[PDB]
Amino acid sequence: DLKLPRQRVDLVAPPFVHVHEQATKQGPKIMEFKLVVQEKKMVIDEKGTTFQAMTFNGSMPGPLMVVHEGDYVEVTLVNPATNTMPHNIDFHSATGALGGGALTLINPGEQVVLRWKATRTGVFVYHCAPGGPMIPWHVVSGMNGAVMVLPRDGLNDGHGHSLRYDRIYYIGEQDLYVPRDEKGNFKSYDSPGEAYSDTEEVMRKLTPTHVVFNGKAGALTGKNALNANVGENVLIVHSQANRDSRPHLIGGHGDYVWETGKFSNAPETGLETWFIRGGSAGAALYKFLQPGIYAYVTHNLIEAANLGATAHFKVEGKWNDDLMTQVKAPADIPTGST
Amino acid sequence: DLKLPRQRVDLVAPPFVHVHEQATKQGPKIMEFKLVVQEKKMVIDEKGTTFQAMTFNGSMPGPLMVVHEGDYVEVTLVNPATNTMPHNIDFHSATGALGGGALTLINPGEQVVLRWKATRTGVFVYHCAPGGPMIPWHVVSGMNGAVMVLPRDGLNDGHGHSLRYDRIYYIGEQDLYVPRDEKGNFKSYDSPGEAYSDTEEVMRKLTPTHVVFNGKAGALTGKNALNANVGENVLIVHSQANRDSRPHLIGGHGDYVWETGKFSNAPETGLETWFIRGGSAGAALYKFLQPGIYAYVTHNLIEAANLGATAHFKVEGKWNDDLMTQVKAPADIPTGST
Amino acid sequence: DLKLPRQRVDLVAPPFVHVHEQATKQGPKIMEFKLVVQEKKMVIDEKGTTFQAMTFNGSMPGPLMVVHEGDYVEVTLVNPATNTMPHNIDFHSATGALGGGALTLINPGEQVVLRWKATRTGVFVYHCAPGGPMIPWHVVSGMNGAVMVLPRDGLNDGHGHSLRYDRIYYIGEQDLYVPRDEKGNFKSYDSPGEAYSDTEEVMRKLTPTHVVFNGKAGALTGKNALNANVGENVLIVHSQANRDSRPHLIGGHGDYVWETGKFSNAPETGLETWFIRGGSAGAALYKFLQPGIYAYVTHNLIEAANLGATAHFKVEGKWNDDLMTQVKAPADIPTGST
Ligand SMILES: OC[C@H]1O[C@@](CO)(O[C@H]2O[C@H](CO)[C@@H](O)[C@H](O)[C@H]2O)[C@@H](O)[C@@H]1O
Ligand SMILES: OC[C@H]1O[C@@](CO)(O[C@H]2O[C@H](CO)[C@@H](O)[C@H](O)[C@H]2O)[C@@H](O)[C@@H]1O
Ligand SMILES: OC[C@H]1O[C@@](CO)(O[C@H]2O[C@H](CO)[C@@H](O)[C@H](O)[C@H]2O)[C@@H](O)[C@@H]1O
Ligand SMILES: OC[C@H]1O[C@@](CO)(O[C@H]2O[C@H](CO)[C@@H](O)[C@H](O)[C@H]2O)[C@@H](O)[C@@H]1O
Ligand SMILES: OC[C@H]1O[C@@](CO)(O[C@H]2O[C@H](CO)[C@@H](O)[C@H](O)[C@H]2O)[C@@H](O)[C@@H]1O
Ligand SMILES: OC[C@H]1O[C@@](CO)(O[C@H]2O[C@H](CO)[C@@H](O)[C@H](O)[C@H]2O)[C@@H](O)[C@@H]1O
Ligand SMILES: OC[C@H]1O[C@@](CO)(O[C@H]2O[C@H](CO)[C@@H](O)[C@H](O)[C@H]2O)[C@@H](O)[C@@H]1O
Ligand SMILES: OC[C@H]1O[C@@](CO)(O[C@H]2O[C@H](CO)[C@@H](O)[C@H](O)[C@H]2O)[C@@H](O)[C@@H]1O
Ligand SMILES: OC[C@H]1O[C@@](CO)(O[C@H]2O[C@H](CO)[C@@H](O)[C@H](O)[C@H]2O)[C@@H](O)[C@@H]1O
Ligand SMILES: OC[C@H]1O[C@@](CO)(O[C@H]2O[C@H](CO)[C@@H](O)[C@H](O)[C@H]2O)[C@@H](O)[C@@H]1O
Ligand SMILES: OC[C@H]1O[C@@](CO)(O[C@H]2O[C@H](CO)[C@@H](O)[C@H](O)[C@H]2O)[C@@H](O)[C@@H]1O
Ligand SMILES: OC[C@H]1O[C@@](CO)(O[C@H]2O[C@H](CO)[C@@H](O)[C@H](O)[C@H]2O)[C@@H](O)[C@@H]1O
Ligand SMILES: O=N[O-]
Ligand SMILES: O=N[O-]
Ligand SMILES: O=N[O-]
Ligand SMILES: O=N[O-]
Ligand SMILES: O=N[O-]
Ligand SMILES: O=N[O-]
Ligand SMILES: O=N[O-]
Ligand SMILES: O=N[O-]
Ligand SMILES: O=N[O-]
Ligand SMILES: [Cu+2]
Ligand SMILES: [Cu+2]
Ligand SMILES: [Cu+2]
Ligand SMILES: [Cu+2]
Ligand SMILES: [Cu+2]
Ligand SMILES: [Cu+2]
């Protein structure tokens, strides 16, 4: 019945994004994606703490899907028989049936195919939602990602000017609730089901033990810093499926920010810190003006520095002393000073 | 001195709203409302937990009041002699005297009459605020509701087009702080005063034991789901007098959202999840496009599924396979699959 | 090389603000500021609790700096040899080098001079950020303030009309994490370093013990209430370097609010409660219409009343009975009443 060209997309692991056009002159297509659920123990912090994760495509976050307004998105969700739990998928971009959740519940050994029309532009969360208490559990165990629905003319500034990014990164932020023993040491388990009761008790107190980007403390620092160059316009998509965040690029700004994440609304300009509501994605464009290291954080700095929520950008280029300069390097305070 | 027609309004219990006009050609009136404080033990969760509530008109939230810009609102607040505490009322819609609180403190056995001019459009919180530590206590014990001040031309989209709702619902969200004994069981008391000291200790740690709509976990699910039909534009007013929330309609969107709640500002379009600042009301319009069950949550999913903060809509009509369809029902993963 | 006039600014302690022009016809200048770090034990609540604070210029918050777009800001940061820790400064208003942090690390007995160009309008946080876990620690120990970069034409309403304030106040909100002993009593220490380990444990649980304006519970109540007069337009700048807040003026509104704090964006009108993202400053203009006491709070009322986060305004002038009046004072409920 639906007679449109079909196009298979190969997803890539975050923070990278599969290839796509910004502006397009192609008409609507059926964009075909496959997500494979993987339950697995994963390392989440720099001390080697593990937890019983549940993922789309083996990553936290799940991969970013990119389509254009008016495309149809045909998703094959697979739940391998090595998994232990039922799973499903809810797209916040989609209309009806609990975002798809009511049409995608699959037991281990099953797959399902859902199609939804991309009628709403923006960045949106997708997440598992099997029912009842299993909804938060699967989400905070890692089963969430995002989808971006671009206007067919690409982004604009809400004032009639086109905006184009040179690079895009997807930062998925995950709140984790890892059980502790009586002495405060993190507990380990042999399966997600075994971890559940103790995890739920932590969840109920609404205070994460870890807040991480790309699935673990330090994931996007060091050798895995995000690259850019002076002069490049970078789109930073940020999602949080369960809990609020307040992104900030240390040493930079958000030139154009859609903190609620929806491209039918004009962006705000020149922000220091923006706000991702739990259960949403947002996006910020920034044109780098200075080389060096930038930290990208949630600006609850306890979370950023002590719970895992810091990424780095490494930006190549030439320093601009007009924007900032060290007029005098550290020196002893003058004895004359009063 | 004030020579305007008077109109008595009969309030109705949330989530329903008393009858009113959207657009009106009536001039300003003195709109007369009565609120009666009721202290009573109430059931707040599906396991039968009770707590010593304090209410306007016997409900959590208090009822939604609806007037138009330039009306005067004349409120008789009654504190029956069966109550134990003084009470008052602060309207965030009002100008002066701490929103009215400084003019409305009444002991049991007293009533007072306050008039305020509806100079500011939007949805607004009202709440009790007796003074000092009693302010948060009375609020988190249930003494909060909302008022909507409509423009006399009704709502608009901020771009010169009228917006009209077919139905309106008021969702009051309440954070509760129920004491526990040493084993974790919820404690019961014979009066609000007896509950206070233990409740304050819970409050101080800023983590609710329950987060509920319409006064209890499950209040708006099952037989009390909210009704709508495909094609109807529904206004969902959401308030939170003490603590942030992030509303989300699962399977839907916010077509037009005033998350800060004030109609002099253009709404945002096409949101997935919006944000109600503690101490405010906001509102979202959505036109239903698909039948079935929708969950309406705060998108901290722990709160939603595990602390009580889920409502349902039951929407009648015909399914639109163009927007969403199950292309292939759950099936065994092909043996060929790699 | 940079050949512009230089102008030394003398800072003043919050909540007051150093003298400045709104609109100016002066061209760009090098505006010279000095900040002196002071580590000291400070009283933070009305029961006399102390903690080992770290400050810019001896105050929490640090003082508000005011410049205009296109000015250069040349800051001498001094770390006296009586201090124990290294310190630095990150300006969210600045571009490059982690906001300046990477160019300003000074040991006790040193000073440094940083210049940054004020290319971005709005109110912005500045804070210490020495590296790693020391970043949140120094910030939540008090080392944060704000800077305002005004357009050279002053403020506007985003619709072509000038806005001018008669008074400005800077409210810095500080979340504090004071250790407790086994019985719940707050602990005291002889130095910041001695307090660190126990403080970090409190920080990790993300629940402040105190939330204060101007450095202590009650700082801006009583004799230190903020003054205004009926008819005056007051700008209230609010910052929070680490944690979200939801400001509300009890009995008033935000006539024009830049909750994200950046003057290139039109303000929202007529808000009840606004939202300061942790890691940002915002600002609200209000024209007082009624005399009397107003409370200014974060509208988590537990925080406001029980953790310290209430300020007062005392407003002189004549009461307007048209906006609000007590129609009937408290009286016994009529025996006839049903
Ligand atoms: O012996 C515990 C010690 O080993 C580490 C090694 O990296 O991790 C082990 O214990 C953690 C806490 O139970 C588990 O999360 C992990 O699976 C296990 O390898 C340290 O993190 C830990 O302190
Ligand atoms: O807004 C994008 C997309 O939403 C649809 C519904 O699929 O329309 C919604 O939003 C419209 C514009 O705000 C409303 O007029 C409409 O009533 C509502 O359903 C599409 O028609 C539109 O392209
Ligand atoms: O945090 C409580 C208490 O637990 C200990 C181990 O007994 O450390 C645990 O907690 C730390 C904070 O989350 C982690 O860094 C560590 O991996 C974990 O074992 C104590 O060191 C701490 O005091
Ligand atoms: O890219 C930052 C990197 O560049 C170096 C020179 O190789 O210094 C530049 O950047 C500094 C600011 O971080 C400037 O103060 C300096 O003048 C400029 O040359 C490195 O020192 C720095 O790590
Ligand atoms: O015996 C306690 C058991 O009874 C229930 C019955 O619905 O509730 C009682 O105890 C609760 C916890 O103290 C009270 O809140 C309630 O008032 C009382 O009826 C169960 O909830 C509870 O576990
Ligand atoms: O804005 C609605 C209503 O507010 C009043 C005061 O009661 O005006 C306020 O807002 C105006 C428009 O933003 C400001 O110009 C004015 O100074 C401020 O008091 C009413 O006059 C107005 O209708
Ligand atoms: O939550 C702590 C601990 O308390 C127990 C009773 O000892 O359950 C209480 O807490 C649950 C979570 O809030 C409630 O569902 C229940 O109504 C309440 O009695 C334990 O079951 C729980 O482990
Ligand atoms: O209204 C939802 C309700 O309708 C039924 C048919 O009575 O199925 C419709 O809705 C489904 C999506 O929830 C579609 O997949 C189906 O094709 C459509 O007929 C019920 O199954 C469903 O509960
Ligand atoms: O004896 C403790 C008692 O004295 C007070 C006096 O104002 O404060 C002392 O103890 C506090 C808690 O340790 C310290 O913060 C403070 O430095 C010290 O003067 C009371 O606050 C306290 O309960
Ligand atoms: O926006 C104020 C200020 O920012 C600068 C960079 O220092 O420009 C940024 O914002 C512009 C307008 O949004 C973008 O066009 C530009 O690419 C971005 O760097 C200044 O040029 C501008 O005055
Ligand atoms: O809050 C726990 C418990 O501690 C005590 C002292 O044992 O009080 C402390 O905590 C109060 C709440 O923060 C403070 O008002 C007080 O300054 C502090 O000593 C008990 O009174 C309280 O029950
Ligand atoms: O400024 C408030 C202050 O003024 C007094 C008179 O001196 O009363 C005025 O304000 C009241 C509202 O707070 C009005 O109800 C009253 O009619 C008006 O005169 C004081 O009572 C009040 O503290
Ligand atoms: O180690 N994780 O269960
Ligand atoms: O059923 N989900 O675990
Ligand atoms: O400026 N960043 O913490
Ligand atoms: O049972 N409530 O006190
Ligand atoms: O005085 N109020 O409980
Ligand atoms: O999509 N709702 O959790
Ligand atoms: O008393 N402060 O450490
Ligand atoms: O190094 N800062 O404490
Ligand atoms: O209206 N203030 O709590
Ligand atoms: Cu799942
Ligand atoms: Cu969701
Ligand atoms: Cu009350
Ligand atoms: Cu209030
Ligand atoms: Cu410092
Ligand atoms: Cu910062």
| Beta-carbon count within 10 A of C337 CB | 12
Specify whether C141 is located in the same domain as C27: yes
| CATH number for the domain harbouring residue C141 | 2.60.40.420
Chain B residue at shortest CA distance from C207: B205
Selection from A13, A15, A20, A11 nearest residue A170 by Cα: A15
Q: Are strands A167-176 and A233-240 parallel, antiparallel or unpaired?
A: parallel
Discontinuities in chain C (C→N > 2.5 Å), after residue: none
Element containing residue A254 per DSSP (H, E): strand A254-258
DSSP annotation of B146: E
Selection from C202, C204, C87 nearest residue C135 by Cα: C87
The whole-angstrom separation of Cα A20 and Cα C195 is 52
C87 labeled part of a ligand binding site: yes
Specify whether B101 is located in the same domain as B189: no
State the burial class of residue A8 (Cβ atoms within 10 Å of its Cβ: 0-12, 13-18, 19+): exposed
Output the CA C119–ligand 15 centroid distance in Å: 18
**Token pair for A278:** 């739990």
- Minimal C-alpha gap between A37 and chain C (Å): 32
Question: Are C328 and B113 an interchain contact pair (Cβ–Cβ within 8 Å)?
Answer: yes
Q: Are strands A64-68 and A144-150 parallel, antiparallel or unpaired?
A: parallel
- Rounded to 5 degrees, φ, ψ at B112 are -145, 155
Q: What share of chain C is helix, strand, coil (3-state, %, to 5)?
A: 10, 40, 45
The whole-angstrom separation of Cα B330 and Cα B98 is 59
Interface of B with C in 49-88 (CB under 8 A): 74, 78, 80-81
**Token pair for C255:** 């006539």
Token pair 């986060």: residue: C309
Interface of A with B in 263-282 (CB under 8 A): 264-265, 275, 277-281
The whole-angstrom separation of Cα C215 and Cα A88 is 49
- Minimal C-alpha gap between B118 and chain A (Å): 29
State the burial class of residue C159 (Cβ atoms within 10 Å of its Cβ: 0-12, 13-18, 19+): exposed
* Torsion, Cα of A91, A96, A101, A102 (10° steps): -170
In a domain, B338, yes or no: no
Contact B143, B172 (CB under 8 A): no
Contacts of A252 in chain C (CB under 8 A): 95
Adjacent-strand bridge partners of C331:
B111
- Rounded to 5 degrees, φ, ψ at B101 are -60, -35
Does the CA dihedral B250-B256-B257-B263 come out positive or negative?
Answer: negative
Largest CA distance in chain B: 86
Contact B52, B43 (CB under 8 A): no
Cα distances from A119 to residues A29, A72, A148, A162, in angstroms, run: 13, 9, 12, 21
Contact B194, B84 (CB under 8 A): no
Domain with B252 in it: 168-316
The dihedral region occupied by B281, where left means phi > 0, alpha psi between -120 and 50, and beta the remainder, is: beta
Specify whether B312 is located in the same domain as B172: yes
Selection from B40, B134, B119 nearest residue B72 by Cα: B119
- Domain boundary (B153, B180, B201) is at B153
**Token pair for B16:** 């329903």
3-state class (DSSP) for residue A135? helix
State the burial class of residue B103 (Cβ atoms within 10 Å of its Cβ: 0-12, 13-18, 19+): buried
Query: For chain A, how many structural domains are there in total?
Result: 2
Contacts of C134 (CB under 8 A, 6+ apart): C85
Element containing residue B304 per DSSP (H, E): helix B301-306
Specify whether B174 is located in the same domain as B307: yes
**Residue B324 annotated among the catalytic residues of the structure:** no
Discontinuities in chain A (C→N > 2.5 Å), after residue: none
Contacts of A219 (CB under 8 A, 6+ apart): A212, A213, A311
Element containing residue B33 per DSSP (H, E): strand B30-43
Mark out the alpha helices in chain C (DSSP H runs). Answer: 134-140, 192-204, 301-306
Cα distances from B200 to residues B26, B203, B208, B212, in angstroms, run: 47, 5, 12, 19
| Beta-carbon count within 10 A of C156 CB | 16
Contact B262, C272 (CB under 8 A): yes
In a domain, C251, yes or no: yes
The whole-angstrom separation of Cα C218 and Cα C306 is 11
**Token pair for A305:** 């520095």
Q: Is the CB of C184 under 6 A from ligand 9?
A: no
On whether any CB of chain C is under 8 Å from the CB of B109, the answer is yes
On whether any CB of chain C is under 8 Å from the CB of A225, the answer is no
Selection from A292, A275, A303 nearest residue A213 by Cα: A303
Contact A164, A225 (CB under 8 A): no
Contact C97, C178 (CB under 8 A): no
**Token pair for A261:** 């994440």
Query: DSSP states of C286-324 as a string?
Result: EE--S-EEEEEEES-HHHHHHSS-EEEEEEES---TTTE
**Token pair for A12:** 């890539």
Selection from A108, A37, A119, A38 nearest residue A76 by Cα: A37
Specify whether A119 is located in the same domain as A196: no
3-state class (DSSP) for residue C193? helix
Adjacent-strand bridge partners of B271:
B254
Tell me which residue in A294, A301, A322 faces C242 most closely, judged by beta carbons. A301
Contact C94, C116 (CB under 8 A): yes
Specify whether B139 is located in the same domain as B202: no
Helices and strands, number each (H, E), in chain B: 3, 22
| Ligand 16 atom closest to residue B50's alpha carbon, by position in its atom list | 1
Contacts of B92 (CB under 8 A, 6+ apart): B99, B124, B125, B126, B279, B280, C248, C272, C273
A253 labeled part of a ligand binding site: no
Interface of B with C in 281-310 (CB under 8 A): 281
Cα distances from C40 to residues C55, C137, C203, in angstroms, run: 8, 15, 20
The whole-angstrom separation of Cα B200 and Cα B256 is 38
Question: Are C92 and A271 an interchain contact pair (Cβ–Cβ within 8 Å)?
Answer: no
Side-chain-side CA neighbours of residue A79 (13 Å): 24
Output the CA B213–ligand 14 centroid distance in Å: 25
Selection from A100, A96, A95 nearest residue A114 by Cα: A100
Specify whether C186 is located in the same domain as C309: yes
Question: Are C272 and B278 an interchain contact pair (Cβ–Cβ within 8 Å)?
Answer: no
Contact A116, B323 (CB under 8 A): yes
Specify whether A301 is located in the same domain as A199: yes
Contacts of B164 (CB under 8 A, 6+ apart): B22, B23, B154, B155, B233
Cα distances from B207 to residues A328, B210, C208, in angstroms, run: 48, 9, 12
Cα distances from B245 to residues A322, B93, B129, B255, C270, in angstroms, run: 43, 20, 21, 18, 21
Q: Rounded to an integer, what is the distance from CA A271 to the centroid of its chain? A: 20
Selection from B127, B135, B212 nearest residue B177 by Cα: B212
The whole-angstrom separation of Cα C44 and Cα B66 is 43
- Minimal C-alpha gap between C13 and chain A (Å): 19
Amino acid letter for position C167: R
The whole-angstrom separation of Cα C278 and Cα B5 is 48
- Minimal C-alpha gap between C191 and chain B (Å): 27
In a domain, A322, yes or no: no
Contacts of A321 (CB under 8 A, 6+ apart): none
Question: Are B280 and C302 an interchain contact pair (Cβ–Cβ within 8 Å)?
Answer: no
Adjacent-strand bridge partners of A325:
C115
Question: Are A323 and C95 an interchain contact pair (Cβ–Cβ within 8 Å)?
Answer: yes
Contact C15, C187 (CB under 8 A): no
Token pair 């660190």: residue: C196
| Ligand 9 atom closest to residue C49's alpha carbon, by position in its atom list | 15
Contacts of A99 in chain B (CB under 8 A): 250-251
Cα distances from C91 to residues A86, C22, C77, C144, in angstroms, run: 48, 21, 12, 10
The whole-angstrom separation of Cα C243 and Cα A297 is 13
| Beta-carbon count within 10 A of C253 CB | 27
3-state class (DSSP) for residue C182? coil
The whole-angstrom separation of Cα B274 and Cα B261 is 11
Amino acid letter for position A147: V
Amino acid letter for position B230: V
Q: Enter the resolution in angstroms.
A: 1.2
Contact C34, C84 (CB under 8 A): no
Contacts of C284 (CB under 8 A, 6+ apart): C235, C236, C238, C247, C249, C254, C255, C256, C257, C258, C259, C271, C274
Chain B residue at shortest CA distance from C296: B98
Adjacent-strand bridge partners of A74:
A32, A115
| Beta-carbon count within 10 A of A191 CB | 12
DSSP annotation of A164: -
Cis peptide before A14 (omega within 30 of 0): no
In a domain, B203, yes or no: yes
In a domain, A328, yes or no: no
Rg (alpha carbons) of chain C, rounded to whole number: 21
Annotated catalytic residue within A49, A74, A87, A210 = A87
| Structure determined via | X-ray
Helices and strands, number each (H, E), in chain C: 3, 22
Contact B243, B278 (CB under 8 A): yes
Chain B residue at shortest CA distance from A280: B273
Residue whose CA is closest, atom 12 of ligand 4? C97
Does the CA dihedral A118-A124-A125-A130 come out positive or negative?
Answer: negative
Contact B73, C302 (CB under 8 A): no
**Token pair for C63:** 């003082």
Contact A217, A128 (CB under 8 A): no
Which of A178, A210, A299, A319 should we substitute to test contact with C (largest number of C Cβ atoms within 10 Å)?
A299
For chain B, first and last CA: distance in Å? 84
The whole-angstrom separation of Cα A1 and Cα C246 is 51
Element containing residue B193 per DSSP (H, E): helix B192-204
**Token pair for B140:** 């988190």
B299 labeled part of a ligand binding site: yes
The whole-angstrom separation of Cα A22 and Cα A66 is 10
In a domain, C45, yes or no: yes
The whole-angstrom separation of Cα A73 and Cα A66 is 10
Contact C251, B116 (CB under 8 A): no
Selection from B310, B312, B317, B315 nearest residue B223 by Cα: B312
Specify whether A294 is located in the same domain as A172: yes
Output the CA B303–ligand 16 centroid distance in Å: 22
**Residue C127 annotated among the catalytic residues of the structure:** yes
Mark out the alpha helices in B32-187 (DSSP H runs). Answer: 134-140
Cis peptide before C28 (omega within 30 of 0): no
* Cα A111–Cα A113–Cα A118 angle in degrees, nearest 5: 145
Selection from C234, C298, C287 nearest residue C17 by Cα: C234
Amino acid letter for position C338: T
DSSP annotation of C72: E
Specify whether A105 is located in the same domain as A228: no
Contacts of B253 in chain A (CB under 8 A): 95, 120
| Beta-carbon count within 10 A of C116 CB | 24
Q: Are strands C30-43 and C6-8 parallel, antiparallel or unpaired?
A: parallel
**Residue A338 annotated among the catalytic residues of the structure:** no
Specify whether A191 is located in the same domain as A132: no
In a domain, C15, yes or no: yes
In a domain, B328, yes or no: no
Q: Rounded to an integer, what is the distance from CA B301 to the centroid of its chain? A: 19
Specify whether C212 is located in the same domain as C307: yes
Token pair 């930038």: residue: A294
- Domain boundary (A129, A153, A177) is at A153
The whole-angstrom separation of Cα C151 and Cα A174 is 38
Cα distances from C209 to residues B265, C214, C307, in angstroms, run: 36, 16, 7
The whole-angstrom separation of Cα C106 and Cα C56 is 14
The whole-angstrom separation of Cα B193 and Cα B208 is 19
Contact A125, A281 (CB under 8 A): yes
On whether any CB of chain A is under 8 Å from the CB of B338, the answer is no
* Cα A299–Cα A305–Cα A307 angle in degrees, nearest 5: 95
A312 labeled part of a ligand binding site: no
C18 labeled part of a ligand binding site: no
Helices and strands, number each (H, E), in chain A: 3, 22
State the burial class of residue C102 (Cβ atoms within 10 Å of its Cβ: 0-12, 13-18, 19+): buried
